[PDB]
Design a protein around this ligand. Structure first.
Ligand code: CA
Ligand code: MG
Lengths: 169, 171, 171, 167
């Protein structure tokens, strides 16, 4: 269930290697989670859906971090709303969507870090382009979970995630 | 999903290692598919199938007829009560696999130096091959097979459930 | 390499689910990896370590210091024995030496109702044991195959590491 | 060792899915040979003199030798065989310059194609061909039992297999 989904998140925040001085731009899960495992780290979210937004700020509340997270609107023109530059960046997919990556590699100070997940054929095709241009590393995770069927258990193989992780030059 | 069907038999067929003058018992899950291709891929061979439904037997043998391998297949009923019909000792056995008593029964009929290839689809099934491997010798391999899968604007590579496959020679 | 050694730590931390006033027993392979992160990821926690080597205990605590986590870790010797000298019952346990004679039943007697243990297996022998302890105390098993680029010449391949099995449970 | 290589060929041959009296152009000798065993023929193209020497060696050892023709390197050698192939295998490098276009040219419509890709590069290329000409991409994650006092399951490298019929 949400199992699969927590195992992905753990891999994302690990890649990102939070320091406390630093501010995330998640492009409402990876942002919120970055707000519970490291103090003095703030997350900026960008979300084109009002409804999904009402949701990110909503759950921001459970873990008492709501006033660190800023839920913004959609890429990439939302960035101009945010004058304060980023240090670490998460794109959990949506790399294929134009003007978006370009726009954000720009808002990123050199020495600034990046992690991108890709779980489509097109998504992953992206990761290799960006990777082959700016460097960084690609690793991937094949995760399966235990599934019962009346009198039988099997190992449901989740979809694979590729993860780009780069430092900027 | 029918691509998984294709790819899995092949591996099964790779594994079985069909030669001149050999007989295959093809026992259990979807009895006939491996028999029919065993019969196809190789000249001068015999297959026996074990099928419960009077009418699932009436689709295995009908199909054989078509590929022209009706000559060399028999369709018996369900094992191991149907092993007691078939008199000659088989050369190779395939199980697609944990029914009460079907292994030991079928196995009391394989002669020294015979070969059997079994496939697991559940964990209960997987853990068994590990224990029949312990005594009986043999070697276990694994197959995750993925097929493109296009939801709307995006392909992913959707994984089938993995398949476990035990291939040993006896003695 | 050290990158599945990072990534495996991550999944084990997320699984252990650290909360306030909690005490981890971190037992077995590489005792300390999970502990100092467990400690260095959540204010207000104590972790317990069980290492056999006098020289390895000296380096775990060294690193707990160098992470300002010196004052919430005890570094004991090997279980199951070293359980007998640690007085307070653990809140969560993690095993990564998953099958030493005795460690588990021992580790286990010490765990309260509705307490949590997450274990790692990397071999089949370990893996089929999680499956047996799974069948007693409940809980759930998932598995991780992690790959990294491997540029053997002009051609990168994606290069799989050995899988890893993880049992997480509530007593 | 050669095991995982056995599973590999077992798969290609299925997707290749031979027909009686069909010609194959296999662009080490594995699949040409394999093609030839299970009245069909095979044309091997091989840059490698020392492997060339080797495939005829195997075709004889196994015994379909006057059914196999070990050619030289592609795509240059392509023009040599004036007789059109009915089915192509690329297990070889499909990113190798001019190799792919040059043989899709020799392939009649209704002719089939199995392509194997086992690198990041070769796989990314395998998607480019798929987009233009069609066909299907599947991938197989094969591991094997590997034993000190323990057994573990060594994951082989994954194969992306492209299979397509020509329109
Ligand atoms: Ca010469
Ligand atoms: Mg009737």
């Amino acid at each position: 269930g949400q199992l699969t989904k927590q195992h992905v998140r753990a891999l994302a925040i690990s890649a990102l290697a939070p320091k406390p001085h630093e501010t995330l731009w998640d492009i409402g899960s990876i942002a919120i989670e970055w707000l519970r495992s490291t103090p003095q780290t703030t997350a900026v979210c960008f979300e084109i859906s009002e409804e999904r937004r009402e949701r990110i700020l909503s759950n921001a509340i459970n873990l008492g971090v709501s006033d660190r997270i800023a839920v913004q609107q959609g890429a990439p023109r939302a960035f101009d709303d945010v004058p304060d530059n980023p240090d670490v960046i998460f794109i959990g997919g949506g790399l294929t969507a134009p003007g978006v990556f370009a726009a954000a590699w720009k808002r990123l100070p050199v020495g600034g870090r990046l992690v991108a997940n890709a779980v489509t054929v097109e998504s992953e095709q992206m990761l290799w382009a960006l990777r082959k241009q700016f460097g960084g590393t690609i690793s991937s995770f094949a995760i399966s979970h235990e599934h019962t069927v009346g009198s039988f258990i099997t190992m449901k193989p989740a979809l694979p995630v590729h993860q780009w992780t780069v430092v900027k030059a």
